[PDB]
């Protein structure tokens, strides 16, 4: 259309999956690596890599909304499964782990950690004895507290704030037994593609209720994170550019997902709502997804996952992808499938 | 061994576990302490969502490792 991109068909309740697929498809560097996976020996409908290759190929070439039934088939799903509502970040964690494993031992091994993996450090200092310890761990996304925070910045401040370990949560200080302690986290590295999960939910133990948090929470088009690093790089500042806003409407138990993206990283935004792709404004993608109160005329619509890209990496991650990047063995297998289907 | 879990409020709690504990066992201990039914829990560690039927040692989780507890926002 006036948009230049195609939507994905809903199978019944697959909006979460469609929203994720667009998000990953427009992670161009990831798309090209998926295209290179050695799937030639794979079974057409059992191979998750081949199904992703197919979805991406058709998103890149088709002029009508693209179907996903072969992808969900490759997941082992049947009709009922495509009617189950799901969490998009759960699917992200499961799908990327699966693709990363399938890339091991191949020419694109390590692509997914290269794009998404950072490292953080957790440090512990005992208060009554001289005993300290730290632990450095990888992450592929960040869980950000929302409740009582106005914006992403206050969430990161809280994320790195020092915390007391006392009471029923005393720290196991080895030969000193359980000890009152302080614990803090800092970031060592932030990845080229930064996935942020907004913790828009709480559990009430008094009524056994999962509850969604729709409070207002602001996130910026441009996100400087250098102050949350253990050490900054003057030649590579941790400045991040907003790429995607994965939006949930409804509650814990059901609702609807769309994704807003500016695929080129240039501030030209589109809304991807299953099969409908439509131009939109910056403010529709961003400020309108801050959450807050609804009117009396749907409801409870706000950002759940955010994707930022490191400014310094934007031209490598959003690098253009052409037909010279797709092995001809792959396009041939896809034509063959199309011709066998029309049988 | 004592691990950490970042709860839904972003607070850190401690958990006493063994490398041979299954993920189901760990969710039961989180229920004990935090009150969240296991079927609602999802645990994130080093980019993986921990799978029922696996053990902590399957993920190389050790003393002072931090798991991240999240819920679901289901959508269609």
UniProtKB/Swiss-Prot annotation, chain A:
User: Where, per UniProt, does this protein localize?
Assistant: Nucleus; Cytoplasm; Nucleus, PML body; Chromosome
Domain USP, first and last residues per copy = 6-311
Q: Which residues form the active site?
A: 15 (nucleophile), 256 (proton acceptor)
PTMs per UniProt: Isoform 1: Phosphorylated. Isoform 2: Not phosphorylated.
> Would you identify the family this protein belongs to, as annotated?
Belongs to the peptidase C19 family.
What's said on domains? The C-terminus plays a role in its oligomerization.
Q: What does this protein do?
A: Hydrolase that deubiquitinates target proteins such as ARMC5, FOXO4, DEPTOR, KAT5, p53/TP53, MDM2, ERCC6, DNMT1, UHRF1, PTEN, KMT2E/MLL5 and DAXX. Together with DAXX, prevents MDM2 self-ubiquitination and enhances the E3 ligase activity of MDM2 towards p53/TP53, thereby promoting p53/TP53 ubiquitination and proteasomal degradation. Deubiquitinates p53/TP53, preventing degradation of p53/TP53, and enhances p53/TP53-dependent transcription regulation, cell growth repression and apoptosis.
Q: What is this protein called?
A: Ubiquitin carboxyl-terminal hydrolase 7
Q: Which organism is it from?
A: Homo sapiens (Human)
- What gene is it encoded by? USP7
Which region of the full protein is contained in this chain? 209 to 553 of 1102
UniProtKB/Swiss-Prot annotation, chain B:
Site keyed Interacts with activating enzyme: positions: 54, 72
Mutagenesis / variant outcome for changing residue 65 to E? Phosphomimetic mutant that binds and activates PRKN
Q: Which residues carry this modification: ADP-ribosylglycine?
A: 76
(Microbial infection) ADP-ribosylthreonine modifications at: 66
The post-translation modification note in this UniProt entry reads: Phosphorylated at Ser-65 by PINK1 during mitophagy. Phosphorylated ubiquitin specifically binds and activates parkin (PRKN), triggering mitophagy. Phosphorylation does not affect E1-mediated E2 charging of ubiquitin but affects discharging of E2 enzymes to form polyubiquitin chains. It also affects deubiquitination by deubiquitinase enzymes such as USP30.
User: Cross-link (Glycyl lysine isopeptide (Lys-Gly) (interchain with G-Cter in ubiquitin)) at which positions?
Assistant: 6, 11, 27, 29, 33, 48, 63
Q: What is the effect of changing residue 74 to K?
A: No effect on ADP-ribosylation
- For the cross-link Glycyl lysine isopeptide (Gly-Lys) (interchain with K-? in acceptor proteins), the position is 76
Task: Specify the effect of residue 72 to G.
Answer: No effect on ADP-ribosylation
Result, substituting residue 68 to G:
Loss of DTX3L-mediated polyubiquitination of histone H3 and H4
Tell me where in or outside the cell this protein is found. Cytoplasm; Nucleus; Mitochondrion outer membrane
Q: Which domain of life does the protein's organism represent?
A: Eukaryota
What range does the record give for the signal peptide? none
The modified positions for Phosphoserine read: 65
Q: Function of this protein? A: Exists either covalently attached to another protein, or free (unanchored). When covalently bound, it is conjugated to target proteins via an isopeptide bond either as a monomer (monoubiquitin), a polymer linked via different Lys residues of the ubiquitin (polyubiquitin chains) or a linear polymer linked via the initiator Met of the ubiquitin (linear polyubiquitin chains).
For this entry, the protein name equals Ubiquitin
Origin species, per record, is Homo sapiens (Human)
